[PDB]
């Protein structure tokens, strides 16, 4: 069962307060370094890690009573998935994925996202030729060091939903 | 002051990750010259000044003979990467990782198996506590509360990987490097520089078609899970079957 981690208290405190939908988007993306939430072993280091955000930020704050985080994260995710911006859709896909990875490990989580509309939006994003092309070509930051494209990472992740 | 340490500190501040505490940041700066000197003594870098210059350039380079000397250690004992059960699961389950242990063609950070054997066990051959090992490795408290897991390339695998020319040294822009990575083929281990171990990058292991649930059950039952003649990912992305043994272990008393 999920349990609040001991570490990274600064991340825990970040979410124990009023957090807007716009702020959650900035955190989930992490293109702005001031909002970049990672850990030592995060797969990439130059964009946020949505698994860290759920595990260390959102779930601990939810548990302390900041229940508005669930609806607000869902709206942040809806917005990101409809943004038409490669990195943001990628980060949306990675947050739904993060829930699944945390479910696999912890076997039970504080809550489960309402994700039907987010899933739909993602499907519709990936039907758009210009979005697929941006994702196929996305080679900024650490993506430049992988043969595996953003697009294919996204596609293989969607298949696991 | 000294210009080399001024640029060092400036560069660190520019790249510092959001998970780094003020205390770690302060220790990283304060201890910098001890790590520079360690690298000089190991013939890893030309001089303490050169250590700082290479850190700022982000381009870590080393002399052939030094890297050959260091590889000898790994060839003798094999290679080790300690990790959590959660991270082992992610290698199999997380689709962006493409069923590889390590960052696809970008590889896996390792130390020598001998070094982890020396550092993680007491003189009575007892595994140190999770708390002690989390401290040694500078990870978050509770990282190993579910077990100290370990990837092991054996000597034979290591030798054949070297014969292919697939061993790498880290650089400033290596995927998986962060703001606490340093030059000198060595780890930054905080104020306790006695915990610092050598550092190389090994080719990733393909776990295509393996299931995390079953692998973790085999580990629970026998203490390890082994791949004979694993498929490795070359730096250029080639998949190549290499003779030797790779293990995923839950570390335990001798």
Residue numbers in the entry:
A (entry chain B): 1 to 161
B (entry chain A): 193 to 446
What do the authors of the reporting publication say about this deposited model?
The virulence of S. pyogenes is enhanced by its toxin β-NAD+ glycohydrolase (SPN; also known as Nga). Once translocated into the cytoplasm of the host cell, SPN contributes to virulence by depleting the intra­cellular NAD pool and producing the potent vasoactive compound nicotinamide, but not by ADP-ribosylation of protein substrates. SPN is also toxic to bacterial cells; therefore S. pyogenes encodes the ifs gene, which encodes the immunity factor for SPN (IFS) as an endogenous antitoxin. IFS functions as a competitive inhibitor of the substrate β-NAD+ by blocking the active site in the C-terminal domain of SPN.
In order to provide structural details of the interactions of SPN with IFS and thus the inhibition mode, we have employed limited proteolysis to isolate a crystallizable complex of SPN and IFS, which consists of the SPN C-terminal domain (residues 193–451; SPNct) and the full-length IFS (residues 1–161). We have solved the crystal structure of this SPNct–IFS complex by single anomalous diffraction and refined the model at 1.70 Å resolution. The model includes 830 residues in two copies of the complex (residues 193–446 of SPN and residues 1–161 of IFS) and 596 water molecules. Two independent heterodimeric complexes in the P1 unit cell are highly similar to each other, with root-mean-square (r.m.s.) deviations of 0.27 Å for 415 Cα atoms (254 residues of SPNct and 161 residues of IFS) in the model. Our 1.70 Å structure of the SPNct–IFS complex is highly similar to the previously reported structure determined at 2.80 Å, with r.m.s. deviations of 0.62–0.70 Å for 410 Cα atoms for each heterodimeric complex. The complex buries a large surface area at the interface between SPNct and IFS (3210 Å2 and 3280 Å2 for A:B and C:D interfaces, respectively). Our higher-resolution (1.70 Å) structure reveals that the interface is very rich in water molecules; 67 and 71 water molecules are identified at the A:B and C:D interfaces, respectively. In our SPNct–IFS complex structure, ∼21 water molecules are found per 1000 Å2, making it one of the wettest protein–protein interfaces. The side-chain of Arg40 on the IFS α2–α3 loop protrudes into the NAD binding cavity of SPNct, blocking the binding of the substrate β-NAD+. It makes an extensive water-mediated hydrogen-bond network with the residues located on α2, α8, α8–β3 loop and α9–β4 loop of SPNct (Gln216 on α2; Ile328 and Lys329 on α8; Gly330 and Asp332 on α8–β3 loop; Gly368, Asn370, Asn373, Ile374, Gln378, Thr379, Trp380, Glu389 and Glu391 on α9–β4 loop).
